[PDB]
Amino acid sequence: VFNATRFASVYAWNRKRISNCVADYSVLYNSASFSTFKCYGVSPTKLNDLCFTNVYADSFVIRGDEVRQIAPGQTGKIADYNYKLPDDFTGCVIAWN
Amino acid sequence: GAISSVLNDILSRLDPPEAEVQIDRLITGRLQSLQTYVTQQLIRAAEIR
Amino acid sequence: GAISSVLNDILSRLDPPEAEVQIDRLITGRLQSLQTYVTQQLIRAAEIR
Numbered sequence: 017v018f019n020a021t022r023f024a025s026v027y028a029w030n031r032k033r034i035s036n037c038v039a040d041y042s043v044l045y046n047s048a049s050f051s052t053f054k055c056y057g058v059s060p061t062k063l064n065d066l067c068f069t070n071v072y073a074d075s076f077v078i079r080g081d082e083v084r085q086i087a088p089g090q091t092g093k094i095a096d097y098n099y100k101l102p103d104d105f106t107g108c109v110i111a112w113n
Numbered sequence: 114g115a116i117s118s119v120l121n122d123i124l125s126r127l128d129p130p131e132a133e134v135q136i137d138r139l140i141t142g143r144l145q146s147l148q149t150y151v152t153q154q155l156i157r158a159a160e161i162r
Numbered sequence: 163g164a165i166s167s168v169l170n171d172i173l174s175r176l177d178p179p180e181a182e183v184q185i186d187r188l189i190t191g192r193l194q195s196l197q198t199y200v201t202q203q204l205i206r207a208a209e210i211r
Contacts, residue, residue: 059128089179103179
């Protein structure tokens with residue numbers, strides 16, 4: 017998901033489910049291997065404490081101007097037609113050039 | 114109108130810059146629910162009096 | 163404190179994530195007018211009683 021070799025397209029993205037395992041998010045927040053690492057419905061430092069049953073990850077590539085469309089409530093060519101999120105989106109978004 | 118009715122759902126989940134906004138909604142709602150209770154009981158006491 | 167007192171002027175004008183905030187004020191405002199009305203008639207019902 018994170019250290020993958022190649023990503024998919026925004027037209028068709030792969031959905032990797034995670035369950036029943038140990039997830040150490042300390043490296044993802046500390047390591048500066050991404051240009052943007054923000055969260056909306058949870059703190060990035062508290063992903064280990066208030067943890068979850070099911071976790072889904074969608075990997076795709078988009079243009080620089082389209083990174084802003086990957087956020088709750090946005091509209092655009094990617095937000096409305098390719099990849100939309102709900103107003104109650106409880107997740108995190110990552111971006112890297 | 115908040116994310117969740119529980120405090121621990123917000124305190125340890127969101128950061129203080131955003132948790133204070135969500136926490137303020139519960140405090141604004143739960144406090145009005147007290148004034149509605151105290152006001153009613155304070156009127157019922159008159160009929161009892 | 164909203165854009166307009168009419169819901170149609172907000173629901174048919176602004177996007178979903180923006181209209182919900184303007185609608186949240188009218189709901190909180192109009193709901194306060196009812197508790198002010200109900201509490202008044204609930205006192206006037208004591209004088210008449």
